[PDB]
Amino acid sequence: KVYISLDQPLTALNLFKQGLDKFPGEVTLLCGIARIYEEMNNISSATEYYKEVLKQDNTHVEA
Amino acid sequence: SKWLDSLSDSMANIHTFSACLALADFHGDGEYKLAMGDLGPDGRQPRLKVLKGHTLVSQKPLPDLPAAAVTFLMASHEPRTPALAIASGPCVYVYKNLKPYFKFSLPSLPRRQTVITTMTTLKKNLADEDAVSCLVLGTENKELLVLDPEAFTILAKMSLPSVPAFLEASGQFDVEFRLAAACRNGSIYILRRDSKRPKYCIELGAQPVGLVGVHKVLVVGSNQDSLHGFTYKGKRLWTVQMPAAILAMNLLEQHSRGLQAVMAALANEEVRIYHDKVLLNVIRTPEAVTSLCFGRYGREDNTLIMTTLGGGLIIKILKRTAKLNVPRKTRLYVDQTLREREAGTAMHRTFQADLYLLRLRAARAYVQALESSLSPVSREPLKLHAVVQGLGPTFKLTLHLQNTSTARPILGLVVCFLYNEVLYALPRAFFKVPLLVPGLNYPLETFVKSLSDKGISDIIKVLVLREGQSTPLLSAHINMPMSEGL
Amino acid sequence: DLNLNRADYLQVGVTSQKTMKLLPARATQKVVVGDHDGIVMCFGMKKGEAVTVFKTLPGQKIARLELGGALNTPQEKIFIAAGSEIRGFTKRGKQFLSFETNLTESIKAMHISGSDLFLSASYIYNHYCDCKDQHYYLSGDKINDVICLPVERLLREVPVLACQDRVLRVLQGSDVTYEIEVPGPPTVLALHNGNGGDSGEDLLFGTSDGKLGLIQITTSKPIHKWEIRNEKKRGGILCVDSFDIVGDGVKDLLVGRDDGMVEVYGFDNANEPVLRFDHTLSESVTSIQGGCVGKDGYDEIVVSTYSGWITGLTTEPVHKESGPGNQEMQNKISSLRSELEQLQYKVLQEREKYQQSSQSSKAKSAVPSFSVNDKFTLNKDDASYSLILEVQTAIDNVLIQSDVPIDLLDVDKNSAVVSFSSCDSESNDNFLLATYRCQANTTRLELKIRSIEGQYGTLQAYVTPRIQPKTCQVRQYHIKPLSLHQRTHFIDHDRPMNTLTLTGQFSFSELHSWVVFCMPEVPEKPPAGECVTFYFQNTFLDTQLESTYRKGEGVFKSDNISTISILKDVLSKEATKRKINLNISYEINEVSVKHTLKLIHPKLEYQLLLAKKVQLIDALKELQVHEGNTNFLIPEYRCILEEADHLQEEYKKQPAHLERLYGMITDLFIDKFKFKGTNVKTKVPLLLEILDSYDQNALIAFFDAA
Amino acid sequence: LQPVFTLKLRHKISPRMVAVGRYDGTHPCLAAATQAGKVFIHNPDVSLLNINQTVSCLTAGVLNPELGYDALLVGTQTNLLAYDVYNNSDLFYREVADGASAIVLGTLGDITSPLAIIGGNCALQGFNHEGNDLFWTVTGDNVHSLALCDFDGDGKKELLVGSEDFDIRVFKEDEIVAEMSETEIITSLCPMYGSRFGYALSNGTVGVYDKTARYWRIKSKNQAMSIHAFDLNSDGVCELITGWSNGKVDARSDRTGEVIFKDNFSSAIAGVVEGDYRMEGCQQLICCSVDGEIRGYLPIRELSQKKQNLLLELRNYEENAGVIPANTKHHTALSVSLGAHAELCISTSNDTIIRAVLIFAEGVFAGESHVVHPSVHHLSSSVRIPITPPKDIPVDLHLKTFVGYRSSTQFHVFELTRQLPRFSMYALTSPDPASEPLSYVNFIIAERAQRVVMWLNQNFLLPEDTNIQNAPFQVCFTSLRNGGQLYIKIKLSGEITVNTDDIDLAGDIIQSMASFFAIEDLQVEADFPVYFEELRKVLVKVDEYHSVHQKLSADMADNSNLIRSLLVQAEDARLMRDMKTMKNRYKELYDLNKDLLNGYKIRCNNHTELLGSLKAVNQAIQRAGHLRVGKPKNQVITACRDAIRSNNINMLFRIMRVG
Amino acid sequence: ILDENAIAQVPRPGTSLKGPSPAVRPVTQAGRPITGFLRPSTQSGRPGTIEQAIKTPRTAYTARPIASSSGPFINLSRLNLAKYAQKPKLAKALFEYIFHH
């Protein structure tokens, strides 16, 4: 949130991938990555990350 | 890489045109200078500047803005430099050796004089490098004055239907002269012997931005970013399309290879030399170019000097050694089509039943709306919608009302607001509306004000109704937002 | 557009003004120069090296050198005037004329018109004809140069006499016909062609403030044709000449300066001049000529430099040949190498002998004397003297000791460092002790000095050159009491004059000595007639100080109370010094204070507006960097956003002007109350507060009331 | 030469804040500070970056060698930010709280990661590509310039620190190597040679240093803003490019400082930096003015005048074979007077007089000179000059005594060099044990009490009558910048007791005596009660200041949010033409602004006091470590920092008490 | 609008937050096609000026209408937070109360 407030998507994405390196399959982190990719409007990666969320949750209302 | 570059400068503020810039011999001894009547950096200060080599040698103020500047030999007695006849106002300053030598005046009109805009020369009998040339002036009054060799008397007066803008003189004046005039009305008129009136006109469809005469074809540059080659009889023979606008067209003629091709100074930062139909020797420039000249500048028979739209000079010396996105269907689609093929009858029947029930419920809701008259769009033509603007305790509520009819005004109408008198304080909750003229959106605004100290959002109704009736003609609703009070 | 390459020639000793000439000789001419030791020499510069000719014997300091000829013959006789006599050489080492012309002090200018000889002096002017006195004049002011119009193209000889007080007295015989007025004290003047002007006669003058002109002296009145009054080209014209270097067909004007600047003026407008090429030289030009001296076939300018470097500016390129890889650089390098080796040998052995012989008891160590061409002028556009020291060698350090509160400002052209040593003002009488070390190899040093309307006193300056014994020479300038009064020729009597009369027991010479002690620009020698009137003018603000005086009486009218108060105090001090017991009687126009305050008001208004705008300049600049200033900034501050630069650069100098104005106002107040017999040295702080407020009407109210 | 390119940038460039960096990886661009706290980037169009804060440093380099992009660094007096301009993303945004007065970017000794060194109040720091503190040490005063140069030739570069104390120290990864004492606040260092570095001051002095000596030096006006070593002549050896305060760019030589190339501008010179704009594979030299014009470059008779000067000297000597007996000798004498200055008397064993004296010393006198100059009624043979140096550094006066008679217009100038020792002050007196100071530092020396007498006699202006050899050896000096004392006592075992209540003075004495007796390492036993308790009280005030700042910051943030909301509400009222509520919103805004300005004054005073307290803590660390020579120094520093991060104040003081 | 925190003013297209064409997918602004799963953190574009943000629908840039800026159990002015801070068991729940309630 802090990094998105300072308009720094590519810092937030690196931080999210660091977190996923810590927590290997977290759903909120993958969903945040997908939200950032959709705000930047490149859906071809937001669909991939929502599909990862699905592979983890499969009931996720957002993805 | 046929165009050997010589000089590229950007501090030279030379805002001339392709017609008020001419190079010729000015002190004999085979050293050609280039005289140009340059405007101000904006167009305020007319200054005549001549160029020898690539350093400025003399710039001197001029009375008014030069409309053209062309050189010519006045007589063959011990041929010195040609005379530079620079056109300014109703006057022609004839310079001999770049010195004020004569001031020809235009014969006035019954005072209402005129101004000269276009000026070229015409050959008398010889048409060689030593021949005598006569001026041809285009007055602002639609007239062409064929002058004398020494710029003091008139040899001919030709009548044109519109103010000329560009001129081309072909042949020898006495026996075979052809005068092509590109006017402001977007037309080329040709003048031949015995014809005081052209009677051979050609329309371009767009105003001609240039005019260069090839020995047989006459090119006309259009405002539609193209060239059109016509014949001297009044019949187009070809047309070529340009990728961008045409700023200035001049003539590139070298007699060694007999190449007489028209140029083109396009607005896309390039210049392409055009023969009859083919492109060749296209060049590039750091900025789009407004004027080009090709001649024997300095001591080279193949010099081309070009001035950028922003100023500066670029001089180039020509070397003598010239599959579809059809979608995909997955297992879901074939299973769905199999279900449809095996159970199509039940789907058809149940969808028809659902459509019947939907028509029933839609008619029900339409009748209920007609009863309550809640449609903001409803013989008796009207259309109203209410917009709310502003946070804070005071909101601006503007009703956009409109009469939607061919031609019939609505005289007696009135608007009445319905609100909760404990939450909103409307000053005038009822007011007449102006005479609604068919086709105009009338914004009729009011100031709603929230009174509740706690945030309470309550609806506000608006009823538009006649003054002799009691049933609202139409209505609208607005959910007032939260107050954000104090 | 013109380019001149700096080619150096032989170096001679230190030269005075207009001490170089060119023998007319189509090939290369010959250069002739005169050193301050009397060694007049001439060379031809055949090929790179100076082929010296008749380098004569040392004598007195050559004050002037001029070549002329009796008849219309090509002028070749070169006449010098060293100490008090005029010697004359032919175009070789044969002296033929030696006119003793027994005088008192020296010669400062001379002109040779065939046989006619017009020489100047400190004040005296003589016109001889072959060692026979024929005309004698004694001006009231020192003469700078003398010329006679062409006695051939015209008929009568009309010698012009340029005085120090900004006048050109065009006299005939032994009495002035009329006097032409010129801005600034004239220093050089020469008819502006090889003949003296096509249209009859024309005189071209150049003044010490930096100004050129073409006074056309007719039979009874002058006809001013143009003037080259400059702004950035300050510097005393020491030399001027006419020669066609541009090659257009009309002769150009080659003019020198005092700050090295050499300028060529072309007449391309066919009647008026225009600058074409300027070049700085790091020393003071003393003579300029045209023609050619090296590699005949290319016109060049010969410039005599103060220290003696006879330089040329040629129109011919220097690097005329090259390849894959000049040699004259190597030749000159090798020559200087060898010379410096052998000179180092000799001077090291002599230093050893001198240091070992310095221990001799009875022996005395003599000192190398040298020359310092100083110029203590007064800038008129400002209120600051501009002192300018020059030495033939380079300087090491310059002391500036004072006895007056003085501001040493900064000069961008100066490259020295400054070192304001901590004065005391209680035990030493030095209210100022500066010290300008000069970096690298600089000869001249220009430094500003700003003194208040009062505080008279001396000012010393110790100069030390970069020579081996490293001696020092002291100079004593004077900051006069009324050091801001530039003398002019006319006043306006319709101003409120606060007259003042001194009476009693004067020798007119002594009263004149008092006025010289009291005023910047007045001749020392008492003017003849026992009755003299001078028309001064304050430069900080225009207030005249007409001063008239006879053998025993003096009237010092004025437009300022401060001026007459200072005069009263200083003259009473001089009287008490010399045991006179004079009698003062003053008078006041009760509106003069109003006039002076109305004069001051615009300056204080401008200073306060300066401060008010520069306070907000930077705050507005912080807003400027955003949103591009398209729609929001008020037009009021938009008028400041453009001129921010000039406002900021004037704010740097503002505080000095504000302090000076406050001091002047408080002195005006104190003095105008002192004349009535009161002592109001106590009400000053209220006046200071009022000026912090500066209600001009409340200011005049406080002036009239208390 | 000729400027290979020129351009005009409309933004005022801050002087010492300029860098060239390939922010696109392969496309070099210019980064430069500007007014309002914005950093602009010129790509070959100008792009702004809102630092929204007054910048004080700026560089650009490779911070993570894994990728080939330059990282734009931006320092502020309370922050430090690395920035990947290409993919806009903070590499690290660290908060220093010590300030950013001078930063560099390179590889230190025995560190495998390019550090972003920084310099603040009195402490340096270091950060890797993520922002982890890997280097930290304390220095004398405010750091003004830093550069990386391999003094000592061992392949790992030590860093050169220019302290506001006028000193230039060289720091290894942990150890201090050497310190040369310049004469003014350093402003710029630049290395491009092996062990040679070019330095600038605020006098205007631009010079060059070998290991521990100056090749050349030139002092002028218009003190240099930015120095940078480049190879303008392409002779293979770099030269000192310099940009002065007037506009002059003079490329000099690293040999005897002879001007080789010269150029001029319209305003001052912000920065000279090398970087290949035109993509030619070879470095360039860009000069950037203060007013925002950039220009980029690609890489005779005076000796005859000297001959003439030699001939003039020969003329003088031949004239010989305002006059003065040739055997006139100027003899000086130093002394010290209490009733408070070091007096220097100059005389002449003749009847001649001393008309004026112009002493020239670098850092003692204000300016470079102190001309004495008696009045004509006061002239005599012997003249005394009082001197009051500001600090204890041995200075060398170059006296120039103007010798001549009374009424003379020209007279000699005798030159003479006299060195005021390090401790020129502290006149010797009689010890009064009632006024004995309690603060003392103790340590042991090698041997040779006679050599201690030598040290004391060569670093102090002791009178002639002093005779002290071995056993008691108690000398009591009284300071002259204060009333304090200085007790040097020596016992038989070789133990030196220094009883100075001042700690900087004891540090100076210990370091000088160590450098004198050729000592590498040493440990002390120091007690400074009245100073240690003051430092303790400062440490106590620190956290209170922190809390107050946090409270005021939260309050001002709340009020700023209120003001933003009120600006929006006022805009809405103005757009609906409700003038009464608009005036109400503006009254509310006026009141909030007045409250916020009051809070701003309070917070600013508190922040100034807190910065003073932090600099006091760091100066305490540096004065504790400074009291020990060699390795026993470094330890303390480390321990001291490790004693602050844990708030173990008593153990902290024990580290600075015994070590 | 009134709060600027992004360092870069005009960063490269693709590194800042500030598919199917509008001929298929409905839109909300010039771009920004309609999304699934409205969350209260959605900005979905941003206005240029305060006037544009006011003179538009209140819920065109957020899931909720935009604001101007984003008895009682215990009276906050009565308790000494310096004493509840000593007891973390009380301090944690008390902070959660003060912050979220």
Ligand SMILES: [Ca+2]
């Ligand atoms: Ca090393």
Ligand SMILES: [Ca+2]
């Ligand atoms: Ca080099």
